[PDB]
């Protein structure tokens, strides 16, 4: 018999992104080659099969630094991290291959799906 | 020029609620009289003006335990904490006064609004 506030989930995500921008309560640095990205472990787990696996691990859950595979593109990661916190994906011709490869590695199935559909339309 | 995934914010919130149920990465206990509630500080701040103020405070941000005013009803808090993590509000005749008082204290304006409208319809 509950009532539901339609905009609540979007409002929560907007405030989690505000916390990220101000670097409040971030508890991990994701290292992608020469670049560093601060984030909240809980948001990363909620969006990515890879981070969900990493941060449920009894040893890795306590790490303050996570280094990604050297093949991972920093811009691709940046675009996906922005997507995690906003629901918006900056998908462009010049970045689509890097975004799709990063989304496959991060296990973000909905992003992989759309990247596949956008590439198929161009061939 | 971004594209947007409509269900993303709801999917994030569902996984944050799963983390809460499994007690993963919870970093605070909220004490309401004889009852204890584990939560994520980031979610509490994102939903409540009171917790936003508390956890941006340079001293209170590091506390593992927060005690609420003894006038706060544990059931009212439980209903609001469930709302924070799900967008669903279990608003009933028997709990509406406690929910509205708790929402005013927690500074959850949208919940206060609706409680006011539901009470006005019954008078």
């Amino acid at each position: 018999s509950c009532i539901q506030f339609t905009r609540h989930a979007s409002d929560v995500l907007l405030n989690l992104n505000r916390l990220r921008s101000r670097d409040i309560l971030t508890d991990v640095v994701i290292v992608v080659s020469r670049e560093q990205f601060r984030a909240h472990k809980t948001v990363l787990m909620a969006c990515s099969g890879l981070f969900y696996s990493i941060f449920t691990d009894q040893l890795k859950c306590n790490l303050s630094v996570i280094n990604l595979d050297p093949e991972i593109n920093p811009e691709g990661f940046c675009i996906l991290l922005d997507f995690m916190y906003t629901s918006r994906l900056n998908l462009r011709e010049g970045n689509i291959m890097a975004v799709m490869a990063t989304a496959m590695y991060l296990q973000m199935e909905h992003v992989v799906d759309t990247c596949r559909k956008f590439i198929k339309a161009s061939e | 020029s971004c594209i947007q995934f409509t269900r993303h914010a709801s999917d994030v919130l569902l996984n944050l609620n799963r983390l809460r149920s499994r007690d993963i990465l919870t970093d605070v206990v909220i004490v309401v009289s004889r009852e204890q509630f584990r939560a994520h500080k980031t979610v509490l701040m994102a939903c409540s003006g009171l917790f936003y103020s508390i956890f941006t405070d340079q001293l209170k941000c590091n506390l593992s335990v927060i005690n609420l005013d003894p006038e706060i009803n544990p059931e009212g808090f439980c209903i609001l904490l469930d709302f924070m993590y799900t967008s669903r509000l279990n608003l009933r005749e028997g709990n509406i006064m406690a929910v509205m008082a708790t929402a005013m204290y927690l500074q959850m304006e949208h919940v206060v609004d609706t409680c006011r409208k539901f009470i006005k319809a019954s008078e």
Binding site: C2, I3, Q4, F5, T6 | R88, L89, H110, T114
Partner: peptide, 4 residues
């Protein structure tokens, strides 16, 4: 607010 809606009836879900």
């Amino acid at each position: 607010w809606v009836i879900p």
